[PDB]
Paper text:
Here, we report the high-resolution crystal structure of the AnkG ankyrin repeat (ANK repeat) domain in complex with its binding site in the [name] cytoplasmic tail that shows, in conjunction with binding affinity assays with serial truncation variants, the molecular basis of AnkG–[name] binding.
In agreement with our understanding of ankyrin structure, the [name] ABD peptide extended into the inner groove formed by the ANK repeats. However, in contrast with the antiparallel orientation (N-terminal to C-terminal binding) observed in other ANK repeats–target complex structures reported for ankyrin family proteins (Nav1.2-AnkB, AnkR-AnkB, etc.), the AnkG–[name] complex adopted an unexpected parallel binding orientation (i.e., N-terminal to N-terminal binding between [name] and ANK repeats). Unexpectedly, we found that instead of the more easily formed antiparallel intramolecular interaction, the fused [name] ABD bound to another AnkG molecule from the neighboring asymmetric unit, forming an intermolecular interaction. We next examined the specific interactions between residues responsible for their binding and found that the AnkG–[name] interface is mainly mediated by hydrophobic and hydrogen bonding interactions. In particular, F1202 from [name] inserts into a hydrophobic pocket formed by I277, V282, and C315 from AnkG. Similarly, F1208, another aromatic residue from [name], occupies the hydrophobic groove formed by AnkG residues L343, L376, and V381. In our solved crystal structure, the corresponding Ser and Tyr residues of [name] form 2 hydrogen bonds with H384 from AnkG.
Author numbering: 251 to 496
Amino acid sequence: EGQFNEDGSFIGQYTVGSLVPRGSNDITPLHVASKRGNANMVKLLLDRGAKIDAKTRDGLTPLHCGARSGHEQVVEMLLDRAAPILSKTKNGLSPLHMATQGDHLNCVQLLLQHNVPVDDVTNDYLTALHVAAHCGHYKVAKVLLDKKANPNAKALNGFTPLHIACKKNRIRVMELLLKHGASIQAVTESGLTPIHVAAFMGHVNIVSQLMHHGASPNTTNVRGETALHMAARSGQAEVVRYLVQD
């Protein structure tokens, strides 16, 4: 009865890789076609019935791969053939998080136009706006905020996109969030404000900018520390010099 199956040793050997065996054929031809952005290959494979929601070991669907690399035509083609828009990877990343991570304005808009909830969260409770603040993607953050992403949304450890822009020294995103209503006095799980976070990592320009917008330097965390205590505990001499000289 095996005579009525596909046989041979070449099926699946030329999808990815170059003579080095891979443990499982989790990466399908549709994943490869979407990562490359070849809409002709995608239409070919979808017409032959390729599984549109197949997942890799990490849980990436073809829609995740197309959005991660910003291949707008592939993404629309997958969405028009009903690829699940909210499919998540093992750590909770939707295709919108991956489009945001690659600073792909076209694919972020395209997913938002297909009714992806703008504040869909990962397992760390990161929205796409959190990810844009982490990467410093000003353009995409502005798109998410225009579609009403919550600028005070909290991750698991209580960080808002503003806390993250301050931890990662993203001055443009920090300024954009403040213009769009991110609370400068928002507090994390351990009582830290955005100026505590910038002062600890030594981001002097962010500390001064937060000071211009009314950040209180005398606020204290759960452990009783002000921003100057944390700048002194970490040794950021220029943050220390700025706080005392002001």
